[PDB]
Amino acid sequence: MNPIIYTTLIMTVMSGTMLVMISSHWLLIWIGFEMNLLAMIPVLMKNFNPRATEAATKYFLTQATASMMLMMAIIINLLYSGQWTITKMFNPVAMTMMTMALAMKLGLSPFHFWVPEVTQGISLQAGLLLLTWQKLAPLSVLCQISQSINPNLMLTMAMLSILIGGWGGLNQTQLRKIMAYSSIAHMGWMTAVLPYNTTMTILNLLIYITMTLAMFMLLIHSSATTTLSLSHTWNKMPVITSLMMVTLLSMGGLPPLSGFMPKWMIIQEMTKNESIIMPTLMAMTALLNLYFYMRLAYSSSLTMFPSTNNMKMKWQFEHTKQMKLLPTMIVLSTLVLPMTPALSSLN
Amino acid sequence: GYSMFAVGIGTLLFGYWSMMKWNRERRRLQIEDFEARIALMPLFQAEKDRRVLQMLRENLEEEAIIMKDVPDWKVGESVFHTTRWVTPMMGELYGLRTNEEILSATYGFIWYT
Amino acid sequence: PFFDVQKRLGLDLDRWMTIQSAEQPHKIPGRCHAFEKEWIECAHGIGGIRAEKECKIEFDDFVECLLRQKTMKRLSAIKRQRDKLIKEGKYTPPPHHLGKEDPRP
Amino acid sequence: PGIVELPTLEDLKVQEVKVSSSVLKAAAHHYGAQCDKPNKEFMLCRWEEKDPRRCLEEGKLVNQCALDFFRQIKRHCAEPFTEYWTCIDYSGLQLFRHCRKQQAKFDECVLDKLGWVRPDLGELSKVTKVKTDRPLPENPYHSRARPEPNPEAEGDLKPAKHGSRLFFWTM
Amino acid sequence: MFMINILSLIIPILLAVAFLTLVERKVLGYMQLRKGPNVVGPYGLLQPIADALKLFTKEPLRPATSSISMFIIAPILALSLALTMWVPLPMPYPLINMNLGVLFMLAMSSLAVYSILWSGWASNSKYALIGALRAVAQTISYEVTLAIILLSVLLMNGSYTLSTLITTQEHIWMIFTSWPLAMMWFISTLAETNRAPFDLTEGESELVSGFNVEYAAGPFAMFFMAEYANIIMMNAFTAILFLGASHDPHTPELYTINFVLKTLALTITFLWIRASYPRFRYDQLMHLLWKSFLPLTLALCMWHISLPIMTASIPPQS
Amino acid sequence: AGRIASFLKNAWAKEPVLVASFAIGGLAIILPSLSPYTNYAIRINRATPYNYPVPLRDDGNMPDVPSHPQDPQGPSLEWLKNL
Amino acid sequence: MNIMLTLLTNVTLASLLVLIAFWLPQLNAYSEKTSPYECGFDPMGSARLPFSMKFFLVAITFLLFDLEIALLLPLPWASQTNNLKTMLTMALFLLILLAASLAYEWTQKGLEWAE
Amino acid sequence: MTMYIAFILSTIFVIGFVGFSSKPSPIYGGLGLIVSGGVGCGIVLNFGGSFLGLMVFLIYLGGMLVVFGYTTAMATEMYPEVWVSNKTVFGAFVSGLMMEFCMVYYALKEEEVEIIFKFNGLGDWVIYDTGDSGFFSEEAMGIAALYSYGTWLVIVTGWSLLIGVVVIMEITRGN
Numbered sequence A: 001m002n003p004i005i006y007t008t009l010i011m012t013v014m015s016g017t018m019l020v021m022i023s024s025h026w027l028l029i030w031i032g033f034e035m036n037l038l039a040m041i042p043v044l045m046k047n048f049n050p051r052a053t054e055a056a057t058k059y060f061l062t063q064a065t066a067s068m069m070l071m072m073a074i075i076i077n078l079l080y081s082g083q084w085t086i087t088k089m090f091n092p093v094a095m096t097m098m099t100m101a102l103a104m105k106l107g108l109s110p111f112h113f114w115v116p117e118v119t120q121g122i123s124l125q126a127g128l129l130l131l132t133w134q135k136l137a138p139l140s141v142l143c144q145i146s147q148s149i150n151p152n153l154m155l156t157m158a159m160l161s162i163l164i165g166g167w168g169g170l171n172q173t174q175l176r177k178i179m180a181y182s183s184i185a186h187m188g189w190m191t192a193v194l195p196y197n198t199t200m201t202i203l204n205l206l207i208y209i210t211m212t213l214a215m216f217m218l219l220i221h222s223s224a225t226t227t228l229s230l231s232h233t234w235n236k237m238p239v240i241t242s243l244m245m246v247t248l249l250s251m252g253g254l255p256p257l258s259g260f261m262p263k264w265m266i267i268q269e270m271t272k273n274e275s276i277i278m279p280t281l282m283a284m285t286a287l288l289n290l291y292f293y294m295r296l297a298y299s300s301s302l303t304m305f306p307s308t309n310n311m312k313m314k315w316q317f318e319h320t321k322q323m324k325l326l327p328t329m330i331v332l333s334t335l336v337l338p339m340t341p342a343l344s345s346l347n
Numbered sequence B: 001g002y003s004m005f006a007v008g009i010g011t012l013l014f015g016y017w018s019m020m021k022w023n024r025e026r027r028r029l030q031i032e033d034f035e036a037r038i039a040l041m042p043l044f045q046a047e048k049d050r051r052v053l054q055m056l057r058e059n060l061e062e063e064a065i066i067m068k069d070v071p072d073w074k075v076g077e078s079v080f081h082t083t084r085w086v087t088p089m090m091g092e093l094y095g096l097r098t099n100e101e102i103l104s105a106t107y108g109f110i111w112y113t
Numbered sequence C: 001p002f003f004d005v006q007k008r009l010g011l012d013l014d015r016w017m018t019i020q021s022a023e024q025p026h027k028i029p030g031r032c033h034a035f036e037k038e039w040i041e042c043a044h045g046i047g048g049i050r051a052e053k054e055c056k057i058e059f060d061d062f063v064e065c066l067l068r069q070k071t072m073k074r075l076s077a078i079k080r081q082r083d084k085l086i087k088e089g090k091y092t093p094p095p096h097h098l099g100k101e102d103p104r105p
Numbered sequence D: 001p002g003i004v005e006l007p008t009l010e011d012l013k014v015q016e017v018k019v020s021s022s023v024l025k026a027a028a029h030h031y032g033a034q035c036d037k038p039n040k041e042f043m044l045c046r047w048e049e050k051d052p053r054r055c056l057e058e059g060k061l062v063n064q065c066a067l068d069f070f071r072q073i074k075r076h077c078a079e080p081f082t083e084y085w086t087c088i089d090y091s092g093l094q095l096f097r098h099c100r101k102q103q104a105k106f107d108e109c110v111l112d113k114l115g116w117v118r119p120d121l122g123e124l125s126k127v128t129k130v131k132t133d134r135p136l137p138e139n140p141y142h143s144r145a146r147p148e149p150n151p152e153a154e155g156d157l158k159p160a161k162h163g164s165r166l167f168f169w170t171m
Numbered sequence E: 001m002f003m004i005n006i007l008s009l010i011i012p013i014l015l016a017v018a019f020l021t022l023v024e025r026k027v028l029g030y031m032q033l034r035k036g037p038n039v040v041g042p043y044g045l046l047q048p049i050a051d052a053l054k055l056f057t058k059e060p061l062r063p064a065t066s067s068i069s070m071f072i073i074a075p076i077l078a079l080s081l082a083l084t085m086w087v088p089l090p091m092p093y094p095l096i097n098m099n100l101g102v103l104f105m106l107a108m109s110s111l112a113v114y115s116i117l118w119s120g121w122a123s124n125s126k127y128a129l130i131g132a133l134r135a136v137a138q139t140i141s142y143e144v145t146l147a148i149i150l151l152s153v154l155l156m157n158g159s160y161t162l163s164t165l166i167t168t169q170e171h172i173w174m175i176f177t178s179w180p181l182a183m184m185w186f187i188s189t190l191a192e193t194n195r196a197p198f199d200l201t202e203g204e205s206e207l208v209s210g211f212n213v214e215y216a217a218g219p220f221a222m223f224f225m226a227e228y229a230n231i232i233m234m235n236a237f238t239a240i241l242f243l244g245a246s247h248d249p250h251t252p253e254l255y256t257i258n259f260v261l262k263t264l265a266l267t268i269t270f271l272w273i274r275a276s277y278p279r280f281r282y283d284q285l286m287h288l289l290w291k292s293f294l295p296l297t298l299a300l301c302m303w304h305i306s307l308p309i310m311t312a313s314i315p316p317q318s
Numbered sequence F: 001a002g003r004i005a006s007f008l009k010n011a012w013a014k015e016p017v018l019v020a021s022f023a024i025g026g027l028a029i030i031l032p033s034l035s036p037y038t039n040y041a042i043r044i045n046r047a048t049p050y051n052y053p054v055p056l057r058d059d060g061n062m063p064d065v066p067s068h069p070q071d072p073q074g075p076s077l078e079w080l081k082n083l
Numbered sequence G: 001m002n003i004m005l006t007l008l009t010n011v012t013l014a015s016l017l018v019l020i021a022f023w024l025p026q027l028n029a030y031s032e033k034t035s036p037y038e039c040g041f042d043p044m045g046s047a048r049l050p051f052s053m054k055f056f057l058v059a060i061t062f063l064l065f066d067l068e069i070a071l072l073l074p075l076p077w078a079s080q081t082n083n084l085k086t087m088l089t090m091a092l093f094l095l096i097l098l099a100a101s102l103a104y105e106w107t108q109k110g111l112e113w114a115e
Numbered sequence H: 001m002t003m004y005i006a007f008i009l010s011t012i013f014v015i016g017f018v019g020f021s022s023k024p025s026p027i028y029g030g031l032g033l034i035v036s037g038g039v040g041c042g043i044v045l046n047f048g049g050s051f052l053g054l055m056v057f058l059i060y061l062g063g064m065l066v067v068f069g070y071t072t073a074m075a076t077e078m079y080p081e082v083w084v085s086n087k088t089v090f091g092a093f094v095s096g097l098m099m100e101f102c103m104v105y106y107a108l109k110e111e112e113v114e115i116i117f118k119f120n121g122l123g124d125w126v127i128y129d130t131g132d133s134g135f136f137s138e139e140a141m142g143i144a145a146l147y148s149y150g151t152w153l154v155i156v157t158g159w160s161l162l163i164g165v166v167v168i169m170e171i172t173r174g175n
Ligand SMILES: CCCCCCCCCCCCCCCCC[C@@H](O)O[C@H](CO[C@H](O)CCCCCCCCCCCCCCC)COP(=O)(O)OCC[N+](C)(C)C
Pocket: G013, G016, G017, G019, G020, G023, G024, G025, G026, G027
């Protein structure tokens, strides 16, 4: 692919997301989604091979079905109230269809199956984009229509997402599928607090995005897509594996690391309403994500796996391309808890 | 080579000038017809108001005759909280008439070719 | 979530098409222009929570104009009673209704 | 929700203008030139009251003015008007352009007999002013009283008491 | 009374098609230094009747491998659409007066391709399939350019009503204003009717009979009649669009005579072109339509939007 | 200025269709901004009376509004007859 | 109503022509007569086998260019607006965008058929 | 009740939808979609939407021509399936027909809420407008307002179409 064409496609993806974020008209929001998908399909196919083509096809089918349901919900809402402005969604059937369409776009359970497959079928850069930038538009719409949400449906989907993310991640040796299941669980956490406080949703999204960016950038720096290939990195660059171990611990939600901050905050918010059983269940379930993060840390940093002879040659060369934002991303992923009250600036 | 291009360009320019003159004349004629319609509009509005009111009154009297059997039916009761005038839905003007008039009132203009 | 770029810059990217009571070409009015105008003026500035209760009458009138459910219910009741009366044979329907009416311009 | 007030049938009776569309179109310009005042009064009533039940007398006056206009036209130029409107009526689109001789004869007759001048192009489409003793309606929409707004934000901003007050943080 | 109008429209069109077959044969003969049909009937005037009687008393075949439903549906669709395409033509008054007659013709013309598509597919033979795919390619070649040319020409009419074209060309023919568009439209109508040099769906030398190779007797005659009716109809549309006859409301017969004469001239030009030139390759038709006609058509559409605004010559009837 | 002349000659010798298309498109783009009759087209569009002109209530302080269609006040279309 | 009657009349006439064609003449159908035609020799494969399309990219581009026709059709009515400058700017913008897309597909060998 | 024309057209619309949704073979699916496009054009025409109906019919005719070519190229088999050549396709078709007939009977003989709300029938003529004014078509004016009011829509639409051309070329580049 031409670099000019790649830049144009990335800019079109971002423009579709921005159009979703700045629009007041439902038609313009739908157009933003369409433009984002149209530009996103070729980016997933940048390195051409059958797996990338399969991932792109599955992604297109899922997102096109979601957009059809989105448009039908908009039209039903218009039928029962001649309104185009994104507001309290005057019809409940239309609101149910809207919620299901947005959940399918986000990959929330039980519309979760496509996320591990698409993530595994594409490159690490495409996976970074898909798991970070592609969450902004549906979450922005959900934040805008939160007051009309049905808490039962969204809470059911969020709890299912957390459970399924943990259970599915428990079974993986491929790093991209691990990241996808982690994303599913974190989306569940984000949507669990949405009917109560959208500021907490934004805070969780920001912290998750920072940690995911650090994770994907560390995985690109050490060209590993499997557990066994990541188990070699200690014999080439131990600093990368140590930073990865601390980042995994933060993603597990352990204090005093930054990944503990959202869950903590969310739990507190849920106890400001009554909502006692659900946060307890959510934390006990997030223990599963912590377990498979810890297994990855065992494989890559806390023990030393056997290496190969040809690795000696790799000792003689340095990394050519350097990521300028990786150190700041790591620091923000780990040492940010003491600045928790700054979340007031989010609302 | 040059002669053919020149002849074509001259033909195009002559056609452009003729069409400009004719289109301006047609615009003036349209303005005149629109002014005639504007002059005629108030009488049509008055007769339309009288026709609508007469149909509504006939429907009201017929409904008052019909619906006196039932216990709890207020005759001529509105369906709107507001007390201002609401344009009739045309299922209210032609609701008690033959299907020929209903067809002519609904699809008469669309089907006229 | 929503970055009100239009409000900050005063651009009007899409607000011209959000409602039916907003500056149509040739001043063509919507079928429910007055009802929507009244509901909007009632609900302006007080927030959605208060508007959902204090502007319920205007919204109900607007929805009745939009979908016309009660009007069809009333028309169906009248027609059913008339049909029963004629079937019993007591209706004695008028000439204008039957198409024998003296039309006016 | 209350009953709907409707005029009686007897109140809706008026002498009718029973000439076809071609006849009306053939005399449209002179009709708009002569009967302008009652028509403008009726249109102002119609657009201000927003209720057909409140401008019935104005409609009757419009009908009376049209009847007087057509009575005069019959009295002075029966034949030229008949020829002109027959010419207009033959056309499928009822076009002015195809019958100018008959229009010229009708115009000459009305000018000589009644001193009537056909309006120039763009004159009947003007926005005019009308003098009426009818009071301007105050609530033509029958609007309810608007709910009172949330009061306001007032006073000077002071730092938050003891900071954020979030768990153990003292700032 | 309206059914009488429908019959008086559709029966004379069929007779005109029948005798257009004879006229085309005789014109080709005399341009090829021969005579053509002059034996059965004086000057071959009974030849179309004999051809029709022979074709409708001949056994029709149902191929063993064919899909029978589509096989029978395709000629019915072709003939019915060809007859229907005539109803909005003002001569000077149309049978059906439409606000958007031009768009109606466009839609029905783009529907007519499925006759060839489905007949070729349902024949279940290789030559028919090749002909149907050539039809797909031909439509993809011409459709967009044809639509843009139509819009560019109608930017001076003011609407899509076909009768307004009579008043638009009251003083001058539209060809004097848009002769490049007229040329491209003429070539596009040659391509739209599958006529030489763009007769690729039949392709007699390459594909035997092409899409209708399995058809015989009456179903084949129906395809023939639909094709020739489309010829006459498209040339009548061109005559109305670019050479506007003067209409006197008290004497429509003069307009009818003038319009019929212009239509016959354009149809004879079609026959002349068939007799004069060799056949395109069907990729070359696509390249001609997409690399030469399309850019010029886009530029001329820009020019015909800009020109009425520049010269304050916008037509009426918003 | 000399190489582009050769480029134009070569384009005219190899792809005349594209040369004509680009010339026509450029003329169509740039000419309307240099014509004095575009505003005449705008005025003609504005002078077409699609809707009824609703009269204004006389408050006694509008000397620019005519009291009758034939009064000297109000807009004029006399510019349109000379076009 | 009239258009529906016209459609019914035309379809009925065509159907009656087919019926007459199939019921008037004498039929003698046998296996060799109804076999597929391939110029006197039996076909090797089936006509239902995949048939390669060499101009698939042009077909997709035709799908995309067909919607610009729907976008540009209302131009005769759009030319009657009061703000002619905005309308002309937007129409020229759309046509320039279409020309740019055609130029992009042309220069990247997109109009060439597959070999 | 008046001639049932709109109801008949909408029923044929649903029937064509069931025809292509049972997925016999893309040839017959395209035929069913063409039939649905035609009856939808008729439905929209009966409501005063001449331009929109004609436009949607033209667009879907072009789309189905491209789909026919692609079906011949890439979606064929030795024996293409019809609605009566396979038990799954026939079962889906019959189930769709019975579902439509049951819903029609339910909403016609009774007045009950299927999913959203209730419905009694009375024909679609009741909710019409009886609006008496105009030397123009309102739909034409609204659609033409795209070039004066919808500048933003024109911008985003044109950008999307150009991006679509670039996107299809990138996707089919292969390598
Ligand atoms: C231009 C378009 C419009 C034209 C207007 C006229 C339309 C004409 C109608 C279309 C059909 C044209 C074909 C006419 C030929 C006859 C075909 C058929 O009807 O006849 C026989 C139909 O008959 C059946 O075979 C059985 C006999 C009748 C069946 C009994 C049904 C019960 C009816 C009661 C009868 C009692 C007396 C009726 C008078 C009151 C079929 O026999 P078959 O050989 O296979 O087919 C080939 C015919 N051949 C021999 C001429 C070649």
